[PDB]
Each structure stands twice: as structure tokens, then as C-alpha cells.
Amino acid sequence: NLPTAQEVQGLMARYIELVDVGDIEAIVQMYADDATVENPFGQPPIHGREQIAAFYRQGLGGGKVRACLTGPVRASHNGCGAMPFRVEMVWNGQPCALDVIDVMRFDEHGRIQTMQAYWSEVNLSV
Amino acid sequence: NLPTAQEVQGLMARYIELVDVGDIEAIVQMYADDATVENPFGQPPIHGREQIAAFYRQGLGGGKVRACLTGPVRASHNGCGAMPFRVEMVWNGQPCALDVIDVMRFDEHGRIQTMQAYWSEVNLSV
């Protein structure tokens, strides 16, 4: 159901693990039907499951992307949480790192209803 | 005006410095006159500088508190950002620490319009 604080910590950690191995189908399953993705926050929300899958396959398709928590998950009692992490990727044909904070709201089924990924170019390191 | 990504990084870092030193009046002046605070996220919003001042005095006025960033500020291009930090307090007569992520939205005068502090008891260490 609506994840407890401890369950939010578990779910958000699981998200990171799935991104880190690059299981696109498993990531998309975490999302609710009405989910929205704002990534980076400030850009228009992505919605529709096909569209969210296309977003992740575009980002993770190369198969080389890595991700890890860089601090503990902060969770609420209303099914939300926030986490700091770092993504290792490739930009301009070179290895890079991107520092991100994700804010997630889960629904009463334990699926992601809204996600918001905070980062900009100030958070990229070549 | 509406802070750029770099300006958001600067403002949110300054906020941490003000909490760390406990300058309640300076903190309150970083907020818009009609700002809303949700701390912890999940609890009822408090509204306006009078209420926000009372909230920070309750948290910071008594026993002395320390605060520091535990990772970089993640900023957007629409005047928003998110940051991870740790608050050190004295509970009972013994030290405790609280891991928090704040999300802030600034207005076009450079003041905090809204903020959300993500944490729960899972983030406390006595």
C-alpha cells in the first residue's frame, strides 16, 4: 500500500539499484499509470507509460550508466521521499559525473506517482 | 530577480550558513513575506514571516544547533533547488544529528517562496 517511511527508503534505494544495472522494464514497472516525470526539474513533465519508457531507454540505452546513493534517503510519513545520488555517464564522448537529487511521491499502491529530478549543468563534472 | 542556477546554489548555501550560526532574523528575511514552510514535509504548512520566525526560534533559539551541507546544491533553471545537509543538535543532554533534504522555490526577488524539508525519525541519530 502507501509506503511507510521505511518502505519509501526501500523503494527509492531499489530505484537506484535498477538504474545502476540498467533494467529499463523493471524501472518503468515502478511507475503508476498516471505518473509524471520532471527530469530535469524545470523541463515539461513527461507522462504516459510508453513515453516514460522511451525516456529511460534513451538515457540508459547505452548500457554503461552507473548510479549510487551519496547520502541516506530522506522519507516522509505521507509516502514521499528525497535522495542524493551521483550518475556516471558519457557526455561529448567523455566520461562524466552528474550529481542529482530525486524527489518522489508514491501512491497508495506503492508505485511512483510523481518524480522530480533536480540537477543542472552546474552539477556536471567532466 | 528570479535566481539563476548559480544564484540558487549561492542562496541555498547562505541559508545553511545562517542556520549554522543561528541568525533567526537573517533566515526570516531570506523568506518571502508570505512564504510557506513544510517541515517536515507531510506536516501542515506554516505561512508568513511571523509564523516562520516562531518556527525557527523554537528550533534554533534554545540549545545551539550546527548545520552543514553534505553534498552540493542541485539547482534548476526555474528558480528552484534541492540540497542535502545534516543538522547537529543536543537532545536530552547528549548530541544528536538529523539528515535532511530541503527543496526551495525562489521568487523573482530572490526570496524563498516555498520550501519543503524532507526527513523523518529514520533520519535521526541520538
The residue segments making up the domain with residue A11 are 1-126
Contact A56, A27 (CB under 8 A): yes
Burial class (CB within 10 angstroms; exposed 0-12, middle 13-18, buried 19+) of B5? buried
Q: Shortest CA distance to A50 belongs to which of A73, A67, A31?
A: A31
Q: Answer left, alpha or beta for residue B9, where phi above 0 means left and psi between -120 and 50 means alpha.
A: alpha
Q: Which residues of A76-87 are buried (b: 16+ CB within 10 A; e: fewer)?
A: bbbbbbbbbbbb
Picking from B5, B41, B119, the nearest residue to A122 by CB comes out as: B5
Name the DSSP letter for residue A96. Answer: E
Q: How far is B13 from chain A (nearest CA, A)?
A: 14
Contact B37, B115 (CB under 8 A): yes
Dist CA B4 CA B6 (whole Å): 5
| Structural domains counted in chain A | 1
Contact A79, A106 (CB under 8 A): yes
> With contacts defined as CB-CB under 8 Å, which chain B residues touch A41?
76, 78, 80
Contact B52, B64 (CB under 8 A): no
Dist CA B8 CA B73 (whole Å): 8
Residue A62 belongs to domain with CATH number:
3.10.450.50
> With contacts defined as CB-CB under 8 Å, which chain B residues touch A78?
41-42
